[PDB]
Amino acid sequence: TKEHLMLAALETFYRKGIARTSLNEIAQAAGVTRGALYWHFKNKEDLFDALFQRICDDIENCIWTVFRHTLLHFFERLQSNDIHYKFHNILFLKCEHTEQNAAVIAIARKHQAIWREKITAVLTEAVENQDLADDLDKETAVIFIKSTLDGLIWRWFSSGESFDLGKTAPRIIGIMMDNLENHPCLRR
Amino acid sequence: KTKEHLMLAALETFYRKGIARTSLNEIAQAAGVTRGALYWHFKNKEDLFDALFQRICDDIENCIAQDAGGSWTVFRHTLLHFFERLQSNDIHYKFHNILFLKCEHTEQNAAVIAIARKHQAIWREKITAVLTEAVENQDLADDLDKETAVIFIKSTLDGLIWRWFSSGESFDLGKTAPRIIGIMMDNLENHPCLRR
Numbered sequence: 001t002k003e004h005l006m007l008a009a010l011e012t013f014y015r016k017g018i019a020r021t022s023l024n025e026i027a028q029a030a031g032v033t034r035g036a037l038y039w040h041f042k043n044k045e046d047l048f049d050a051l052f053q054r055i056c057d058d059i060e061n062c063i064w065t066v067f068r069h070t071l072l073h074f075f076e077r078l079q080s081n082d083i084h085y086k087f088h089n090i091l092f093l094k095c096e097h098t099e100q101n102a103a104v105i106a107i108a109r110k111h112q113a114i115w116r117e118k119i120t121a122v123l124t125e126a127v128e129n130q131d132l133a134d135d136l137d138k139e140t141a142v143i144f145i146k147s148t149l150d151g152l153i154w155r156w157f158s159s160g161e162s163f164d165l166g167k168t169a170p171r172i173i174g175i176m177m178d179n180l181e182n183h184p185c186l187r188r
Numbered sequence: 189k190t191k192e193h194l195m196l197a198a199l200e201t202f203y204r205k206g207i208a209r210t211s212l213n214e215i216a217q218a219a220g221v222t223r224g225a226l227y228w229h230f231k232n233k234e235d236l237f238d239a240l241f242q243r244i245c246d247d248i249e250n251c252i253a254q255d256a257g258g259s260w261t262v263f264r265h266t267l268l269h270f271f272e273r274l275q276s277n278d279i280h281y282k283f284h285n286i287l288f289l290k291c292e293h294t295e296q297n298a299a300v301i302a303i304a305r306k307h308q309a310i311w312r313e314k315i316t317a318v319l320t321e322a323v324e325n326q327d328l329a330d331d332l333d334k335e336t337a338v339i340f341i342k343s344t345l346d347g348l349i350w351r352w353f354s355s356g357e358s359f360d361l362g363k364t365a366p367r368i369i370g371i372m373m374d375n376l377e378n379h380p381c382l383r384r
């Protein structure tokens with residue numbers, strides 16, 4: 001039930017962006033009344049919330065060496081999975097930071113916060129297995145990892161997928177992994 | 189004269205409501221200028237935006253003689269100066285904020301996006317030339333893969349900008365940019381996976 005309402009929201013978000021999308025438009029695309037949507041999702045914010053939730057759940061249910069493979073499969077998924085493609089397209093390209101979109105942005109910052117605590121934890125555990133050095137600057141390292149991954153995603157979507165993500169993502173990730181283990185700039 | 193006032197007005201409004209929701213008429217209302225005076229400087233909205241991108245680019249290019257021994261060194265200085273300016277120059281902050289966060293890739297914005305893609309292909313070519321000079325100068329290896337390195341540089345830099353704006357400027361760009369740039373330059377110089 002609720003899953004049908006989410007995908008229409010995702011599809012509408014993908015064509016018009018979040019700002020210029022209305023509940024009315026979503027309920028029509030799913031072919032239900034404005035009243036029927038409201039029972040499950042009280043506003044656009046909540047649909048966006050559930051959609052981000054399915055993305056994070058997808059990534060969770062597919063599981064330091066695991067970290068690498070999790071990064072690799074995230075970028076494959078962007079190409080082969082239609083929902084992950086559209087959601088991150090929407091997040092990066094169709095989600096203006098205007099005052100109208102303020103509740104959405106707050107929702108997205110909530111999920112981004114979880115993603116950060118989770119990276120912080122993986123690094124915390126990796127330092128103990130002697131995978132990473134004990135004087136690793138973890139605060140810098142987490143800005144580094146997210147900035148690396150954000151940059152590839154933004155560069156891929158904003159260039160209109162003008163390069164081969166399947167060939168580029170592994171090289172970017174491997175280099176990132178190398179810098180985390182070895183580069184002195186990432187040490188305290 | 190008052191073409192600057194129209195430009196600052198367009199910048200402030202784009203920053204307020206994003207590009208798509210902003211109108212030609214409300215820019216001129218914020219600039220204290222008649223509609224016909226606006227069409228006297230600016231045929232439409234994407235020309236205002238193109239003139240904003242041009243000003244950002246002029247500002248950056250104009251510093252390069254002052255950023256300059258050797259050009260691979262100049263590149264490093266231009267990158268560092270860019271993020272410095274992002275922090276200290278309101279026009280450059282607002283413009284890149286608009287570019288990354290207030291310019292939806294919808295059909296309503298198609299003309300503006302085409303303009304943005306034009307200034308980026310120029311930036312692409314400028315990188316490709318910087319790299320090319322650095323191979324001949326022996327600052328980079330003869331078997332560097334220029335096509336990969338360009339995507340690498342743009343990816344790295346886009347990520348830092350996107351991260352900083354998205355996070356609400358929640359980390360110190362003045363401390364992070366040199367580290368990010370340091371690592372990127374090191375990789376271009378040394379990392380095997382950027383060679384062919």
Ligand SMILES: CC(=O)[C@H]1CC[C@H]2[C@@H]3CCC4=CC(=O)CC[C@]4(C)[C@H]3CC[C@]12C
Nearest residue numbers: 248249266267270311314315342345346
């Ligand atoms: C002046 C200069 O060398 C140009 C060539 C490459 C350009 C950068 C390439 C990546 C980039 C993407 C943007 O969205 C604007 C800022 C930046 C960070 C550009 C700033 C100006 C640079 C550094």
